[PDB]
Ligand binder design. Sequence first.
Ligand code: NH2
Lengths: 109, 12
Amino acid sequence: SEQLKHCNGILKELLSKKHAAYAWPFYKPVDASALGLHDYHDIIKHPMDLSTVKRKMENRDYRDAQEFAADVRLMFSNCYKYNPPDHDVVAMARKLQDVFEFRYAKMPD
Amino acid sequence: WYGYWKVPKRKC
Ligand SMILES: [N]
């Protein structure tokens, strides 16, 4: 579908060098043990990250654009839930989500 | 912003 091509384009942009300075914490699943975040999976019940969204897009797991958007926003919501708002990862999340939301709002009819 | 953490999640 046309809308899922738009989603795939957004995903390509989120993973591109253009945004790499702030997108990189979202490239792969949070490795809680490696980062010393031993409470992460007590707080975040449904982890999400861009490599998982990419795999689901490639396997045509998204029935529509709404399902894709729900995973992307889940990613950002997990970051806002786990991390205090003054932590740098939150400023990075907000910049990346600005990129996402403004382009997602251009979804072709 | 420089691609790594000085302190994970908290400090670039
Ligand atoms: N930092």
